Amino acid sequence: LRQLIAQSWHTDEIRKLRPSPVDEAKWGFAVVENSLWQGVPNYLRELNEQLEENLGYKLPVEFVPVRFTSWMGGDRDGNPNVTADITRHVLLLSRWKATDLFLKDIQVLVSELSMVEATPELLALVGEEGAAEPYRYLMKNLRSRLMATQAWLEARLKGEELPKPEGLLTQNEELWEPLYACYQSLQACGMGIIANGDLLDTLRRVKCFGVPLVRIDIRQESTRHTEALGELTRYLGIGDYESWSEADKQAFLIRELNSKRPLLPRNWQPSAETREVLDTCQVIAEAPQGSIAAYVISMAKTPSDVLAVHLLLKEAGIGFAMPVAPLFETLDDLNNANDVMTQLLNIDWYRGL
Amino acid sequence: LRQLIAQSWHTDEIRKLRPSPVDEAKWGFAVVENSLWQGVPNYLRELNEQLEENLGYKLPVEFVPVRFTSWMGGDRDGNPNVTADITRHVLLLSRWKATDLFLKDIQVLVSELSMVEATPELLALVGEEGAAEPYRYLMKNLRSRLMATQAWLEARLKGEELPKPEGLLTQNEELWEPLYACYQSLQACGMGIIANGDLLDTLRRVKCFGVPLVRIDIRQESTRHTEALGELTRYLGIGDYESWSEADKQAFLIRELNSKRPLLPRNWQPSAETREVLDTCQVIAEAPQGSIAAYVISMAKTPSDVLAVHLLLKEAGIGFAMPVAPLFETLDDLNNANDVMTQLLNIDWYRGL
Amino acid sequence: LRQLIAQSWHTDEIRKLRPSPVDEAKWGFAVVENSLWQGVPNYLRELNEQLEENLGYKLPVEFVPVRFTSWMGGDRDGNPNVTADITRHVLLLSRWKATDLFLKDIQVLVSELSMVEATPELLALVGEEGAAEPYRYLMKNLRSRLMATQAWLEARLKGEELPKPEGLLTQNEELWE
Numbered sequence A, B: 001l002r003q004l005i006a007q008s009w010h011t012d013e014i015r016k017l018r019p020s021p022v023d024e025a026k027w028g029f030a031v032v033e034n035s036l037w038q039g040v041p042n043y044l045r046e047l048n049e050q051l052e053e054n055l056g057y058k059l060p061v062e063f064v065p066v067r068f069t070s071w072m073g074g075d076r077d078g079n080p081n082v083t084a085d086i087t088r089h090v091l092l093l094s095r096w097k098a099t100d101l102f103l104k105d106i107q108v109l110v111s112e113l114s115m116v117e118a119t120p121e122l123l124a125l126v127g128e129e130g131a132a133e134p135y136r137y138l139m140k141n142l143r144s145r146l147m148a149t150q151a152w153l154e155a156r157l158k159g160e161e162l163p164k165p166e167g168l169l170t171q172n173e174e175l176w177e178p179l180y181a182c183y184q185s186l187q188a189c190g191m192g193i194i195a196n197g198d199l200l201d202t203l204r205r206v207k208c209f210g211v212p213l214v215r216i217d218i219r220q221e222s223t224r225h226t227e228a229l230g231e232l233t234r235y236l237g238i239g240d241y242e243s244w245s246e247a248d249k250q251a252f253l254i255r256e257l258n259s260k261r262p263l264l265p266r267n268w269q270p271s272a273e274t275r276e277v278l279d280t281c282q283v284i285a286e287a288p289q290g291s292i293a294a295y296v297i298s299m300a301k302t303p304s305d306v307l308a309v310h311l312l313l314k315e316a317g318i319g320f321a322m323p324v325a326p327l328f329e330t331l332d333d334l335n336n337a338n339d340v341m342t343q344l345l346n347i348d349w350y351r352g353l
Numbered sequence C: 001l002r003q004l005i006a007q008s009w010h011t012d013e014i015r016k017l018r019p020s021p022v023d024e025a026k027w028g029f030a031v032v033e034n035s036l037w038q039g040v041p042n043y044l045r046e047l048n049e050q051l052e053e054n055l056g057y058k059l060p061v062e063f064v065p066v067r068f069t070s071w072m073g074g075d076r077d078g079n080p081n082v083t084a085d086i087t088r089h090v091l092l093l094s095r096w097k098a099t100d101l102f103l104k105d106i107q108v109l110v111s112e113l114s115m116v117e118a119t120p121e122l123l124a125l126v127g128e129e130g131a132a133e134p135y136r137y138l139m140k141n142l143r144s145r146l147m148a149t150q151a152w153l154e155a156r157l158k159g160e161e162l163p164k165p166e167g168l169l170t171q172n173e174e175l176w177e
Helices: A002-010 A021-054 A084-112 A120-126 A134-157 A172-188 A192-208 A222-236 A246-258 A272-286 A303-314 A331-346 B002-010 B021-054 B084-112 B120-126 B134-157 B172-188 B192-208 B222-236 B246-258 B272-286 B303-314 B331-346 C002-010 C021-054 C084-112 C120-126 C134-157 C172-176
Strands: A215-221 A292-298 A324-326 B215-221 B292-298 B324-326
Touching (some): A084 A134, A084 A172, A084 A215, A215 A222, A215 A272, A222 A303, A272 A303, A292 A303, A303 A324, B021 B192, B084 B272, B120 B172, B134 B172, B172 B192, B222 B272, B292 B303, B303 B324, C120 C134
Parallel strands (some): A215 A292, A292 A324, B292 B324
């Protein structure tokens, strides 16, 4: 205890400079491995135990009701330092850290799960060369898989381009598949005490953290979206979005959201601010599905604020549903919140989105 | 002579299979190094000598009135085997062969051009570490430059992606600059006999062949362009290009050629044929400027046939002027040729293009 | 002819420093490729032709009565500059140059020797995958063999140690076979 205290007194490095988004992101990673990594599985362990003892049943293994997300590297509201590049960087860095922590988890299983008796099905996934040690087999392919992506990430993180490997991991499903199989087997062949041990923990960390480690939200103010769209419309000669009434904006947005003809020019040199709005959306469309959880709109006031973002995400190439949430942070906006949503829900197209 | 004849009698491998465009392209390369490489400089040498002897003056060194182009890998008229990929491949292969032949040329200069006396200006380009052997210096940087691009090409030719090097050569100007400098110097410091020797030859091979070795033309029939455009318009709900009168087509094309809003959908799954028409244009836009000499349109009949291609090249990202030539290959078309061109030249926009 | 003469007049670099044994060795290599390489085979060609025409018989193919040796890098008599290292270096350099010149020779054969009909025995050495082009086959293994040793030599010549390859050539018998 005396050394620990002494260390805190002599090892104190006050920041000389303002922290960057990447530093704040790393700070979040430290919280994950030093507390959340063990904390979530322990809470889930106790939750079930209390459910069965009082209610008479546990929750299915596949059910993990907890998820952790972050704003570090995603929230760019009034923060010019959070650029599309920083976000892109932070996204790779999270994936990298995820392989670091999962690697440790897998190393354990590769040592403990040495049992030989396994169910027929599992015996198939491994087949020949994997009948000697079925479980130990799958876990080693997972470790090779992980070291592969980690290796790639470290390269991309240094600014080095390189053809992505074969076993590159990008979806939690890829981690859950083999681990869940081992679990299923051990449970059947009479080894539940083992399955519900370290395996159950890693399995839960997959659905709570997964490949991205901690998903992130993107948040930007409605104004920036409006200004970028107005610049886009003026360039095309369509008119000035910034000066159209709410009705005209809605008309324009619904028309272009249903349009199959692109709107965004291929070779365009927009202003700095507008470009950031456009690049950020490009990062969202490129990042593996499951990396970004939601897109929050600060200062949301009208229905068009919500539709605007859906349009930009569309012209970005987004290939899936992206939760877009309005942020009402004003007395007036909060009072109108309900009207704004009522109007949105009355737009049949928006309901189907 | 007896061995040579005997060789022809025992070394005869009749093609078992039909030749691919890449083979025909290689055949063209064989003509270049075994005859054109020496032939052009010798003809240019004699041309000047006769000009001065009879007219009393030679043509400026920078004036090389001869250029060689090829259709192998470019002409896809009625030839399904010439795909966008083959063309892309043949383009790299030509660049590669160009470095092979220029490498030999440069090796010579690196040996012969050892003189020390050089003009002040040249002494600058080399500066320190290059004053000992100014000429021998520049030529070695050119050789390093060449081996660099050649190395890269060999990688791309094998289907291996890799960050392009620094001294990558893509423009004849990059080869002409240093060589012409050496020439200028040697001429001033009283060494014209040397300058107008092997140097003058390589200098001429630069403007006649250059980096691409032999430029190529792309040729496709008007029909394919029409069918791809009709598919594009029907997909967008604009209408059916294939069924519009000549007037309507011209109207549509002139409108979209002046438009700043893209027309080509980002994520589109068109038919095989239409896709080939679109990819070919993408190859033209990606290839270094100076790789493709002209785009020929077989079966040209109307003004819209010419404008159609200009539109596709525009939606491809072409960043420069591309000679588009109509091909009148019919009695009727030849009789209308003049009217068709008169109408084209009456379109002010087309005149400025 | 005028350019050739002019070149000799402007391209003259008198040695500033005394030549090293390695330079004298390279000079010898220049004599080999620019004159001896063609000269020996031409002399042997004429020798046989005259033997048969006057005596009535040619010498067996395996009989090559000419050999060239050198002292550059070997003679250290009263020459302190020829050390054990220089000799070791010159030895690698010769081997290297040998692969360079033989490489050119082999490239030719890989192009001309395309005939298909071959004797049973030869068909064996090539076997499967080599029946299509028996001769063209062996010559390509020889080229791979050569580029292998050449690659190794270039490494050793730069002072870089490295496990010697598999098809490393060290005996004329390996080329002759």
